[PDB]
């Protein structure tokens, strides 16, 4: 009953991810009003999420359900590289969005000059190049491999493929993928909240006698509680399991990894709540 039951959940996850991340892309492509410098970062994020949902989730689900890797030994390194690439490219895009929002409020007069359609493309290409220099190059050159008997036995068997990595690669990959964007987003959003509070105070001092921070708190909570709660638990055990051998089990690692995969299915709800997006979604369907 467990085999039949979980397959339904995995298929539902796949369908939700694909349907969520294709609609945004086609709405942005079809409509000329939504083509804005802001909306290119959402385009890149949606592309990364769609690639993840199509390439990573189905094969991981099949590997779990079948319990053996029926495909060749060459196709598992490619799968791991794709997974790492998508994961590390789906977070720096959020960091870029946060920085772009910071520059709008902090410098209102100079926002148009600093951000131009030519610079957005360069930023996106740099993000994707950096993502590809930590996923394909070290994995495909066999620099991440660990040196112990279980790892060698797993490497020499075609039907078995698990993740065994070194201390240095794990630390470097986690630092590049998660922690630096986390610090940058924390600083950015704290400053934005400070500016919003100052504006509210000024309005209250000016027009106080007439009736005419819940909004900022709710928005920032939705922004920063669906990302930290989804990715932070995994990137701690990622550091831990290479320092203490018996502290972290394999099942906990796999489940905490799969919890962070569903974040790609939530992004359209969080970042595409604008009325302009709603009108486009209504026009496409119905």
Ligand X SMILES: CN[C@@H]1CCc2c(ccc(O)c2O)[C@H]1O
Residue ranges of the annotated binding site are: 83, 88, 173, 238, 257, 261
CA pair distance 105, 108, nearest whole angstrom: 6
- Residue 264 engages ligand X in binding (rule: CB under 6 A): no
The residue among 58 and 222 lying less far from ligand X, judged by its C-beta, is: 58
The residue among 39 and 238 lying less far from ligand X, judged by its C-beta, is: 238
Half-sphere exposure of 155 (CA within 13 A, CB side): 12
Q: Summarize the annotated binding site for (S)-carazolol as residue ranges.
A: 83, 173, 257
Minimum CB separation of residue 86 from ligand X in Å reads 8
The residue among 219 and 257 lying less far from ligand X, judged by its C-beta, is: 257
The residue among 39 and 134 lying less far from ligand X, judged by its C-beta, is: 134
The residue among 81 and 219 lying less far from ligand X, judged by its C-beta, is: 81
- Residue 87 engages ligand X in binding (rule: CB under 6 A): yes
Q: Which of 163, 189, 231, 271 binds ligand X (CB under 6 A)?
A: 163
Q: Which of 49, 83, 92, 100 binds ligand X (CB under 6 A)?
A: 83
Conformation bin of residue 67: beta by default, left when phi > 0, alpha when psi is -120 to 50:
left
Lookup result for tokens 């924390």: 186
- Which residues share a beta bridge with 165? 145
Q: Is residue 37 packed enough to be buried (19+ CB in 10 Å), middle (13-18) or exposed (0-12)?
A: middle
CB of 265 closer than 8 Å to CB of 20: yes
User: How many distinct helices (H) and strands (E) make up the chain?
Assistant: 15, 0
- Residue 69 engages ligand X in binding (rule: CB under 6 A): no
CA pair distance 92, 98, nearest whole angstrom: 10
- Residue 80 engages ligand X in binding (rule: CB under 6 A): yes
The CA-atom distances, in angstroms, between 179 and each of 16, 34, 92, 182, 245 are 28, 32, 11, 5, 23
88-107 binders of ligand X (CB under 6 A): 88
- Residue 177 engages ligand X in binding (rule: CB under 6 A): yes
Size of the site for ligand X (CB under 6 A): 10
Paired tokens of 88: 């590390």
Binding region for ligand X (CB under 6 A) out of 77-85, 154-162, 185-193, 222-230: 77-85
Interacting residues toward ligand X by CB under 6 A: 80, 83-84, 87-88, 163, 173-174, 177, 257
């Amino acid at each position: 009953v467990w085999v039949v039951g979980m397959g339904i959940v995995m298929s539902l996850i796949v369908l939700a991810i694909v349907f969520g991340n294709v609609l945004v892309i086609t709405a942005i492509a079809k409509f000329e009003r939504l083509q804005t410098v802001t909306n290119y970062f959402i385009t890149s994020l949606a592309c990364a999420d769609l690639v993840m949902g199509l390439a990573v989730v189905p094969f991981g689900a099949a590997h779990i359900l079948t319990k053996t890797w029926t495909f060749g030994n060459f196709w598992c390194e490619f799968w791991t590289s794709i997974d790492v690439l998508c994961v590390t490219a789906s977070i720096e895009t959020l960091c870029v969005i946060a920085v772009d929002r910071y520059f709008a409020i902090t410098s209102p007069f100079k926002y148009q000059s600093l951000l131009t359609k030519n610079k957005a493309r360069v930023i996106i290409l740099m993000v994707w190049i950096v993502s590809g220099l930590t996923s394909f190059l070290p994995i495909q050159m066999h620099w991440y491999r660990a040196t112990h008997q279980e790892a060698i036995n797993c490497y020499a068997e075609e039907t078995c493929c698990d993740f065994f990595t070194n201390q240095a690669y794990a630390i470097a990959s986690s630092i590049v993928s998660f922690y630096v964007p986390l610090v940058i987003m924390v600083f950015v959003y704290s400053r934005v909240f400070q500016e919003a509070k100052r504006q509210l105070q000024k309005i209250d001092k000016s027009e106080g006698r007439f009736h005419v921070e819940h909004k900022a708190l709710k928005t920032l909570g939705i922004i920063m509680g669906t990302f930290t709660l989804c990715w932070l638990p995994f990137f701690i055990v990622n550091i831990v399991h290479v320092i203490q051998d018996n502290l972290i089990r394999k099942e906990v690692y796999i489940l905490l990894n799969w919890i962070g995969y569903v974040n790609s299915g939530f992004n359209p709800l969080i970042y595409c709540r604008s009325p302009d997006f709603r009108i486009a979604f209504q026009e496409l369907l119905c």
